[PDB]
């Protein structure tokens, strides 16, 4: 998929952070460029993350797989519910 191709470019060239707590910290600062959320996310946690993105005007993407798929798509061997990319390098988005 097109989103997976860009994640690989970011994973090798840019800068990112994994996990809900670290992603929220980047949103409190101004470094976040894009936030990706898996479809397997607790409803109350998703609503809180989306509220932060609206306040800071950060684009947000709803991933089509669960936290297992999102972790695999990043080359990791663990599950990730939320991803935040602080630096995008050589990528459109």
């Amino acid at each position: 998929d097109t989103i997976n191709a860009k994640l690989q470019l970011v994973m090798k060239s840019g800068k990112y952070v994994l996990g809900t707590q670290q992603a929220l910290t980047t949103l409190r600062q101004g470094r976040s460029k894009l936030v990706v959320i898996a479809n397997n996310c607790p409803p109350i946690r998703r609503a809180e993350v989306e509220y932060y993105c609206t306040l800071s005007k950060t684009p947000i993407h709803h991933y089509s797989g669960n936290n297992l798929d999102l972790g695999t798509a990043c080359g990791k061997h663990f599950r990730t519910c939320v991803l935040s990319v602080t630096n995008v390098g050589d990528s459109d988005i």
């Binding site: 397997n40 669960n66 936290n67 297992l68 599950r79």
Partner: protein, 88 residues
């Protein structure tokens, strides 16, 4: 090394109850003690407590379904039918 050739968990029965009845019960015995995938969260952590009751070690969530497996094949068909009729 491997401790039995044919009967893994039924070896606790010795030579008693007959080969075919032991064989049929083994398939359901293995299923009811395995760990099933949890759609909530992402872990293989669903364990049966009592007949028809499953609890997730990670989610700490309780689901009702299946005497010896988490989801029966008849349940999968029913979910698709209901979703299709709702979309009409």
């Amino acid at each position: 090394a491997k401790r039995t050739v044919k009967m893994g968990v039924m070896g606790r029965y010795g030579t008693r109850y007959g080969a075919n009845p032991r064989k049929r019960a083994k398939k359901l015995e293995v299923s009811q003690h395995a760990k099933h995938f949890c759609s909530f969260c992402g872990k293989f952590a669903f364990r049966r407590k009592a007949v028809g009751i499953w609890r997730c070690d990670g989610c700490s969530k309780t689901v009702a379904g299946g005497a010896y497996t988490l989801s029966t094949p008849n349940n999968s068909t029913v979910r698709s039918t209901v979703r299709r009729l709702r979309e009409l």
